[PDB]
Each structure stands twice: as structure tokens, then as C-alpha cells.
Short mmCIF file of N, CA, C and O in Angstrom, two decimals:
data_model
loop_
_atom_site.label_atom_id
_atom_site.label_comp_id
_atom_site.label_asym_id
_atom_site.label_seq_id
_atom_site.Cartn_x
_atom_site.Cartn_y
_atom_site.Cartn_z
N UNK A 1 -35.31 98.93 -104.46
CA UNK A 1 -35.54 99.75 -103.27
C UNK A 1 -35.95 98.82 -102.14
O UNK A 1 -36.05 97.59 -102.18
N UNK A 2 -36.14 99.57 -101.24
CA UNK A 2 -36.09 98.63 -99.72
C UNK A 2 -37.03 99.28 -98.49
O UNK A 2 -37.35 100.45 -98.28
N UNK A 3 -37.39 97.83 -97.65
CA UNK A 3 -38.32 98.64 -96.67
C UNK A 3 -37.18 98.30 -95.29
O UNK A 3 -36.95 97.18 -94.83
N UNK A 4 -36.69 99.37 -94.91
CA UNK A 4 -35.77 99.26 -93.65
C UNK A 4 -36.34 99.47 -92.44
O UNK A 4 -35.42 99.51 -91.63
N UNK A 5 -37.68 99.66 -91.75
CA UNK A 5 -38.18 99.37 -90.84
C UNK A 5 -39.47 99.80 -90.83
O UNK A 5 -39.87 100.65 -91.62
N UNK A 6 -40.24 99.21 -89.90
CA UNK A 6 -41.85 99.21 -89.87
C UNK A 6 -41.82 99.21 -88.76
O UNK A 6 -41.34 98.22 -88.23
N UNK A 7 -42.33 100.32 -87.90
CA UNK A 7 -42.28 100.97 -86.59
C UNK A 7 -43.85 101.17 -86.18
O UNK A 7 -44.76 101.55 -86.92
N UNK A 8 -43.97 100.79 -84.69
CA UNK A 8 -45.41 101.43 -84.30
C UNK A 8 -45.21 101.79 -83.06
O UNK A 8 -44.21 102.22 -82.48
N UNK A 9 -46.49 101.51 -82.66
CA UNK A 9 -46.06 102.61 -80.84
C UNK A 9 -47.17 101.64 -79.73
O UNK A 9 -48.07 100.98 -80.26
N UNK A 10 -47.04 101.64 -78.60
CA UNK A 10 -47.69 100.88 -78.10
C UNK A 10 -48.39 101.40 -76.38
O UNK A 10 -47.60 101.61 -75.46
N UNK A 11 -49.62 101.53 -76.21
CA UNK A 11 -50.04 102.82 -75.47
C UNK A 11 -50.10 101.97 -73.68
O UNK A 11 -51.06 101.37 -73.21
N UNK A 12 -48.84 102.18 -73.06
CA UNK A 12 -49.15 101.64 -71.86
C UNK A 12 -50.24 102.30 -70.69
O UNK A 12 -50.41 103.45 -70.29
N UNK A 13 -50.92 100.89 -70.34
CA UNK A 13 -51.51 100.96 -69.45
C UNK A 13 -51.68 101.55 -68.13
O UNK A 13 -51.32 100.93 -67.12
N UNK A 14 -52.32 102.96 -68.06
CA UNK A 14 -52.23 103.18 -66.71
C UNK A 14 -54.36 103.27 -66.08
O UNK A 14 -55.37 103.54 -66.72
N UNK A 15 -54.20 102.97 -64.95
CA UNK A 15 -55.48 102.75 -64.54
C UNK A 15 -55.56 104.09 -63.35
O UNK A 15 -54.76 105.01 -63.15
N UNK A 16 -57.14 103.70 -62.54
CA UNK A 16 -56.93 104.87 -61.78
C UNK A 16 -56.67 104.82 -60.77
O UNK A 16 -56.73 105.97 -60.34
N UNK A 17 -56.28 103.92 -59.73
CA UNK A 17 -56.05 103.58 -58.48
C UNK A 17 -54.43 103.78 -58.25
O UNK A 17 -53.98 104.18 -57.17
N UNK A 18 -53.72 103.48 -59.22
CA UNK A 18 -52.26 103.57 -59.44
C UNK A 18 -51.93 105.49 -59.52
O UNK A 18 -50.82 106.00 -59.38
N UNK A 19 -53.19 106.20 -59.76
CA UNK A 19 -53.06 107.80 -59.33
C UNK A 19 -52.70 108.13 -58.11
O UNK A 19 -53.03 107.22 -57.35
N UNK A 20 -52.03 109.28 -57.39
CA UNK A 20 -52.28 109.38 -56.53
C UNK A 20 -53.60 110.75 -56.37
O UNK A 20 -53.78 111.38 -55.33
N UNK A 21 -54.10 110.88 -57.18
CA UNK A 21 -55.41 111.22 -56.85
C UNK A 21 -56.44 110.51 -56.60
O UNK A 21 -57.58 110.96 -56.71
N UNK A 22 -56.13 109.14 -56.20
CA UNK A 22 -57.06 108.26 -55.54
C UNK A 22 -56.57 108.54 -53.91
O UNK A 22 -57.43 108.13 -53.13
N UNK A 23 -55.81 108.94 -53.46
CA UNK A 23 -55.88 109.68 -51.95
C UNK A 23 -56.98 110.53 -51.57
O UNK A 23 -57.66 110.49 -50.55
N UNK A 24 -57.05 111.41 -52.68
CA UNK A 24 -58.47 112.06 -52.58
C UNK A 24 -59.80 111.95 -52.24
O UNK A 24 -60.49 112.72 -51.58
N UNK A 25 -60.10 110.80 -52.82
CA UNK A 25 -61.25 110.08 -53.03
C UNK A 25 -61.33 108.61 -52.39
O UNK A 25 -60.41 107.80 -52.52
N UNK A 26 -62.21 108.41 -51.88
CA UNK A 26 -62.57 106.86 -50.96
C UNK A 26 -63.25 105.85 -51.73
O UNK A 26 -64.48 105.91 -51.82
N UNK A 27 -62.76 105.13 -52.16
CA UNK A 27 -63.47 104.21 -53.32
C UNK A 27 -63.62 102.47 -52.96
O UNK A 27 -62.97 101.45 -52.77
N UNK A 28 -64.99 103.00 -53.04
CA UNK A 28 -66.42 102.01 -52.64
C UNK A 28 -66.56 101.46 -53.92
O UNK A 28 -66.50 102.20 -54.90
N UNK A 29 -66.78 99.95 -54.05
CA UNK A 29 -66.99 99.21 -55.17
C UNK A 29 -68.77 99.06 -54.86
O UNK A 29 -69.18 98.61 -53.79
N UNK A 30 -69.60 99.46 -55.84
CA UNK A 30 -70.94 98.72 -55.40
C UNK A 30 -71.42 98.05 -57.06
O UNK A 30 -70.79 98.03 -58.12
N UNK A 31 -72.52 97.64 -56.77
CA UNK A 31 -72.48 96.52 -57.92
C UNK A 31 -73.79 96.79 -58.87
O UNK A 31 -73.70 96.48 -60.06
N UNK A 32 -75.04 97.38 -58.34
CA UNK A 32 -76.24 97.60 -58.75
C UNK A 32 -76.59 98.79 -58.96
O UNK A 32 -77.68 99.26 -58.64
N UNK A 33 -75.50 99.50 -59.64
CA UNK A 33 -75.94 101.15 -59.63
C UNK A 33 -76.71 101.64 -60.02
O UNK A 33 -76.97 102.76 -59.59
N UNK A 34 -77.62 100.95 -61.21
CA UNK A 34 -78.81 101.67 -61.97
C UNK A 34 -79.90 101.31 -61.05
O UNK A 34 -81.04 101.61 -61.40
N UNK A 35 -79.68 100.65 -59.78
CA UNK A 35 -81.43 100.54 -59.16
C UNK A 35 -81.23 101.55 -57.77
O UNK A 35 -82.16 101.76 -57.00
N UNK A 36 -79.93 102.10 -57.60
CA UNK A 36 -80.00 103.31 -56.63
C UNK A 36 -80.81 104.17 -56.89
O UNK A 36 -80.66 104.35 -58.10
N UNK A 37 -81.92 105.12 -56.40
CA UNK A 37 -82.42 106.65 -56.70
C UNK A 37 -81.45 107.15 -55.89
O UNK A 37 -80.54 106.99 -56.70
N UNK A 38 -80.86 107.66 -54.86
CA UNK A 38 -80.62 108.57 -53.89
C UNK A 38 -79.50 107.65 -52.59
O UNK A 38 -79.40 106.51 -52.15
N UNK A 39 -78.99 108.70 -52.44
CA UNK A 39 -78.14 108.35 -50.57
C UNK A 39 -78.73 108.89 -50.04
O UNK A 39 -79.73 109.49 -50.43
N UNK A 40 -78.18 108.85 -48.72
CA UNK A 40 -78.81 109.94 -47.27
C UNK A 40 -77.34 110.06 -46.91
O UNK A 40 -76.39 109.33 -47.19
N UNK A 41 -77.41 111.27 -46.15
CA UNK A 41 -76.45 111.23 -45.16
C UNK A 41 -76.76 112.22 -43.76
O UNK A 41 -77.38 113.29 -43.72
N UNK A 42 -76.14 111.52 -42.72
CA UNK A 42 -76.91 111.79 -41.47
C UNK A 42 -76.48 112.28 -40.59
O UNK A 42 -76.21 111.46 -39.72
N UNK A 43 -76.09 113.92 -40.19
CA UNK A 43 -75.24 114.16 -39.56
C UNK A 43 -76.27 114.66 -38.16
O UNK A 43 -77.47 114.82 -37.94
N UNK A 44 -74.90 114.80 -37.35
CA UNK A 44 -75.48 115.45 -35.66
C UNK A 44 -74.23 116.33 -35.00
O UNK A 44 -73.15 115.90 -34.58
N UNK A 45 -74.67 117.52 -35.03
CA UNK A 45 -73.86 118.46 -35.15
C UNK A 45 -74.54 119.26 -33.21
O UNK A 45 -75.43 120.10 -33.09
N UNK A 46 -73.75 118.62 -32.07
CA UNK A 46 -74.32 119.02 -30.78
C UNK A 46 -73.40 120.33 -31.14
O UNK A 46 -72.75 120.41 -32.18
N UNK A 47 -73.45 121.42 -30.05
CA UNK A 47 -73.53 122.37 -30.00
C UNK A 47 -73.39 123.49 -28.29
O UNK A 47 -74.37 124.15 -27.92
N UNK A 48 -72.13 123.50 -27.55
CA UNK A 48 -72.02 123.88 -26.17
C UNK A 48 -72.28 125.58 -26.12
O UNK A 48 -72.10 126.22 -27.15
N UNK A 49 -72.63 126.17 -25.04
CA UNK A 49 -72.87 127.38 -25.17
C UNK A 49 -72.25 127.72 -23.71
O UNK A 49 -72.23 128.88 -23.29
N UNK B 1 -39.45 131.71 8.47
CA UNK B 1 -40.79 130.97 9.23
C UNK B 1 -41.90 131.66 8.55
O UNK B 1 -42.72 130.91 8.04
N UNK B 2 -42.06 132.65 8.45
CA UNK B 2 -43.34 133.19 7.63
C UNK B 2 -43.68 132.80 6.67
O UNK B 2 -44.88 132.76 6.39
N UNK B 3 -43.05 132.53 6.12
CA UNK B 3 -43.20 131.56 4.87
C UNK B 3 -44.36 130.22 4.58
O UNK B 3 -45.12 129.84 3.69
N UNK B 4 -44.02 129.88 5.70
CA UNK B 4 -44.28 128.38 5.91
C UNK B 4 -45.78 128.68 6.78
O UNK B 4 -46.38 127.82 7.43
N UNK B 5 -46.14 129.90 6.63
CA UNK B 5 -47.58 130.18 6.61
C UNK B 5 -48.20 130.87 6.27
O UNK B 5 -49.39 131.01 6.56
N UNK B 6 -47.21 131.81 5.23
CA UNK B 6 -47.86 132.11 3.84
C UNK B 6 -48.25 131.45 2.97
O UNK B 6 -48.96 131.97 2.11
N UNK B 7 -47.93 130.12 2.89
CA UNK B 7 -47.76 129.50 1.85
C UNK B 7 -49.38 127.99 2.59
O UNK B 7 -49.44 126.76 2.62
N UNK B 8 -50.16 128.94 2.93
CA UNK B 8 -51.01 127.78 3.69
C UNK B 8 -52.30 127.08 2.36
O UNK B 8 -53.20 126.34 2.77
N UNK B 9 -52.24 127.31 1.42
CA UNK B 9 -52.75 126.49 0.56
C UNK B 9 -51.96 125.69 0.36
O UNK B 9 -52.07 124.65 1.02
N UNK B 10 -50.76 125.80 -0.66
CA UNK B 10 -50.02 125.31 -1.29
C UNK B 10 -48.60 124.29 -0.77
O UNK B 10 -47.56 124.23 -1.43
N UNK B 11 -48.80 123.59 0.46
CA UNK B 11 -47.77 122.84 0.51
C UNK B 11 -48.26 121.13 0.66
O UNK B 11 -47.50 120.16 0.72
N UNK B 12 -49.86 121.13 0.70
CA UNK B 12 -50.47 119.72 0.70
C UNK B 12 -50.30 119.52 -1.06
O UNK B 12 -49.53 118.63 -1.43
N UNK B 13 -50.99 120.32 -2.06
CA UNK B 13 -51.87 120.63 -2.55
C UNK B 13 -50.84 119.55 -4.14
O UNK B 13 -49.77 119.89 -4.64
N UNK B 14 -51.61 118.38 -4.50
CA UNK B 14 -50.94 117.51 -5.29
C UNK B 14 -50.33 117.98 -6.83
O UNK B 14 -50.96 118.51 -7.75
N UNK B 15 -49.23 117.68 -6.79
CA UNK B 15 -48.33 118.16 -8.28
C UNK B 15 -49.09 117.59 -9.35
O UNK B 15 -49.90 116.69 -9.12
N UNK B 16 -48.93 117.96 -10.33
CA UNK B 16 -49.22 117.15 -11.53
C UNK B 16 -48.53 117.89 -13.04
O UNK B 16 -47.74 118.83 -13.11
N UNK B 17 -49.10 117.18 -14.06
CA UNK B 17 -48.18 117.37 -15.36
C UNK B 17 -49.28 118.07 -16.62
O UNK B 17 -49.77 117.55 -17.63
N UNK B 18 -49.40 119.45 -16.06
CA UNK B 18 -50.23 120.06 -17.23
C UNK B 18 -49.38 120.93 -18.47
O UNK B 18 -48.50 121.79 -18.45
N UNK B 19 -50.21 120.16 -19.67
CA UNK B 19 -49.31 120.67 -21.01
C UNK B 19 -49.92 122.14 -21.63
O UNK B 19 -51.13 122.30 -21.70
N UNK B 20 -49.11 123.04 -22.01
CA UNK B 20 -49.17 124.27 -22.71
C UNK B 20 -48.32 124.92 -23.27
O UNK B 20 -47.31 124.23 -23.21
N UNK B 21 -48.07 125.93 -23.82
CA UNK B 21 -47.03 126.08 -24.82
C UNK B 21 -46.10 127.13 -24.03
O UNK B 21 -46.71 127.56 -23.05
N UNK B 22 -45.09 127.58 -24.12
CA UNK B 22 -43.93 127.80 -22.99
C UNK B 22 -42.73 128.65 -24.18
O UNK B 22 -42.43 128.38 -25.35
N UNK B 23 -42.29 129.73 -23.23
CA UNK B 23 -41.20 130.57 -24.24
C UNK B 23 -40.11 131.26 -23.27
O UNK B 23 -40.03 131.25 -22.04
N UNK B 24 -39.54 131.68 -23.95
CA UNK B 24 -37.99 132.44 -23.30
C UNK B 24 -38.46 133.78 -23.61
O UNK B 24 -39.06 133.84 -24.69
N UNK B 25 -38.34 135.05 -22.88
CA UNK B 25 -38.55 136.07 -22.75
C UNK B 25 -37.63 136.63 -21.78
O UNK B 25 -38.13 136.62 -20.66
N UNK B 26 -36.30 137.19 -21.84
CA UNK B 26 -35.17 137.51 -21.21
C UNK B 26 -34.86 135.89 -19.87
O UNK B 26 -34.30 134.80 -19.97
N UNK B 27 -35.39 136.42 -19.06
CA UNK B 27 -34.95 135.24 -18.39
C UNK B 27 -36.44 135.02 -17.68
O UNK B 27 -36.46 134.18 -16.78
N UNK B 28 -37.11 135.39 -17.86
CA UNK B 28 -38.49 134.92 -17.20
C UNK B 28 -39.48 134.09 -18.08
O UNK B 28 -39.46 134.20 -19.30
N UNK B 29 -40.21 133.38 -17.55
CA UNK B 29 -40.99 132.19 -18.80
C UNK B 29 -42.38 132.46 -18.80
O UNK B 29 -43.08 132.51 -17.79
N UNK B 30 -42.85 132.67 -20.31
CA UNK B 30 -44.34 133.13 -20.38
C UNK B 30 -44.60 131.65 -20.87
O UNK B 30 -43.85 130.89 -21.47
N UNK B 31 -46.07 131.46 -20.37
CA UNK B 31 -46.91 130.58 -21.15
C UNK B 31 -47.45 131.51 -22.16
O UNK B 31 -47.70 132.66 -21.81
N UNK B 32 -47.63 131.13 -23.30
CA UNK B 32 -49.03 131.83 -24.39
C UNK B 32 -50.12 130.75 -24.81
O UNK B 32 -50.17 129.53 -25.00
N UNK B 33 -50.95 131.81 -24.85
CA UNK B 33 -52.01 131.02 -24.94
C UNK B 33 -53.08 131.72 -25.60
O UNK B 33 -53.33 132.90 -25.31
N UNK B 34 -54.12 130.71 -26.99
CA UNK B 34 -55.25 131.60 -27.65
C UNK B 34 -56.48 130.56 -26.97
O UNK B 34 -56.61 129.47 -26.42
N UNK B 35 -57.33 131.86 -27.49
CA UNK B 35 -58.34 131.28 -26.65
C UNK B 35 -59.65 131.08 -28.06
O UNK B 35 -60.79 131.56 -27.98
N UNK B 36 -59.36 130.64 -28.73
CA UNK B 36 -59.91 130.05 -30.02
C UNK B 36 -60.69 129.17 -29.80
O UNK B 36 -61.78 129.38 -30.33
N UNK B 37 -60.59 127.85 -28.99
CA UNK B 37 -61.43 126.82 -29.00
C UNK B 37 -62.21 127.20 -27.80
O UNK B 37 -62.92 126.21 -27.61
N UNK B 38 -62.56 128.29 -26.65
CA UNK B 38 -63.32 128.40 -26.20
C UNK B 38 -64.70 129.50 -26.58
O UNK B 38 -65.83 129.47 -26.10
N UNK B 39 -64.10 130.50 -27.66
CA UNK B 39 -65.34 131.15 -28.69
C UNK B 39 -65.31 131.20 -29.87
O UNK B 39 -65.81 132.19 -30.40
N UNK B 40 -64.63 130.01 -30.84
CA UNK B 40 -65.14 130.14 -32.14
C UNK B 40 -66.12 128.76 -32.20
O UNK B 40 -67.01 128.64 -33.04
N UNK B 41 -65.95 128.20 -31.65
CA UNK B 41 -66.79 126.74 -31.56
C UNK B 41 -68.23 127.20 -31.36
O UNK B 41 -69.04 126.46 -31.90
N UNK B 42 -68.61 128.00 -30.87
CA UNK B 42 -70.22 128.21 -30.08
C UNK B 42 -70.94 129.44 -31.09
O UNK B 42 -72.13 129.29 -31.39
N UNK B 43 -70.26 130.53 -31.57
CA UNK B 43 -71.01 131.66 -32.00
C UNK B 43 -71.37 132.44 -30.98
O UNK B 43 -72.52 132.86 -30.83
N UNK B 44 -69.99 132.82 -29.87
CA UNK B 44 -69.51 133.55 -28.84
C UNK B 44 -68.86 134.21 -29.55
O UNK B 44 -68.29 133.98 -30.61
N UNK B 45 -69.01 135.41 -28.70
CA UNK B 45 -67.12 136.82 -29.55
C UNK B 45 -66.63 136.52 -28.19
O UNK B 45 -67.15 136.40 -27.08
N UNK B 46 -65.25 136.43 -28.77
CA UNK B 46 -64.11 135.91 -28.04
C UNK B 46 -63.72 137.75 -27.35
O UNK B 46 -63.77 138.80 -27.99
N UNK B 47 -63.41 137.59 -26.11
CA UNK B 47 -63.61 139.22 -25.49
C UNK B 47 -62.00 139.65 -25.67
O UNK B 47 -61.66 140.80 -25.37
N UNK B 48 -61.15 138.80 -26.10
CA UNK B 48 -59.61 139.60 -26.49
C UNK B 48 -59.87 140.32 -27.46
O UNK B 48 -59.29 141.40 -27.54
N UNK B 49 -60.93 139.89 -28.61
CA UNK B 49 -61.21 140.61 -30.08
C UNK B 49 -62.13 142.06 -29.67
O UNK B 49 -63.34 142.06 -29.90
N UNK B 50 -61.43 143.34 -29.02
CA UNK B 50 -61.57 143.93 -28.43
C UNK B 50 -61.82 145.38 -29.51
O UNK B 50 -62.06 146.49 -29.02
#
């Protein structure tokens, strides 16, 4: 008897920037994330009457 | 000749190039126009919403 082929599979690489659901999203590289507590963000919203 | 002093504002009075939106209505030309950005911006009622 005989072994006529030995087959496997091979899982290509896709990452997330190559999404286009990175249009969505604005992506900031930062480097020290565990010593962040908190952001701010600071808006000014004038107002004509 | 009457004309030409009926017309006593309007024969100095400088041309210029104002943009708005423009249509065919048999042979006469309407501008249209909403008036959205002068009372939804403030927390005004807009007085067409009648």
C-alpha cells in the first residue's frame, strides 16, 4: 500500500491596516499605555443668536 | 426717458457675482432657497415652519 499525498493548509496573513475599516478609525501609535489614567478633550462650542 | 429716472438707484450701483440655486419654471426663473442655516444653528423656530 501507498501514501499518495500529505496535504496541509497554510493561514495567510492579513493585518489591520490593510482593512478598509481602518478609514474609520485614526490610528495613533503611542508607546506607554499602561502609565496613561485618562485623556481630556476640549471642546468650544460659540453660539450666535 | 422715464425710465432713466425711474431707475435712480440702480444705474451707478456695482455688479457683482452672487451664488444661489436657480430653476426653470415655464419661462420665468425662480431662485429657491431654505432657510436652515439661519434657525437650526441657534435654537430659533425657523418662521416658514408655520
Amino acid at each position: 500500500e501507498a501514501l499518495l499525498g500529505v496535504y496541509t493548509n497554510v493561514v495567510e496573513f492579513v493585518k489591520f491596516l490593510e482593512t478598509a475599516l481602518a478609514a474609520a478609525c485614526v490610528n495613533t501609535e503611542f508607546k506607554d499605555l499602561r502609565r496613561m489614567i485618562d485623556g481630556k478633550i476640549q471642546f468650544k462650542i460659540s453660539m450666535p443668536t | 426717458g422715464d425710465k432713466a429716472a425711474l431707475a435712480d438707484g440702480h444705474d451707478e450701483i456695482q455688479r457683482t457675482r452672487i451664488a444661489a440655486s436657480l430653476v426653470k419654471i415655464g419661462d420665468k426663473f425662480v431662485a429657491i432657497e431654505s432657510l436652515q442655516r439661519m434657525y437650526n444653528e441657534t435654537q430659533f423656530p425657523c418662521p416658514l415652519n408655520r
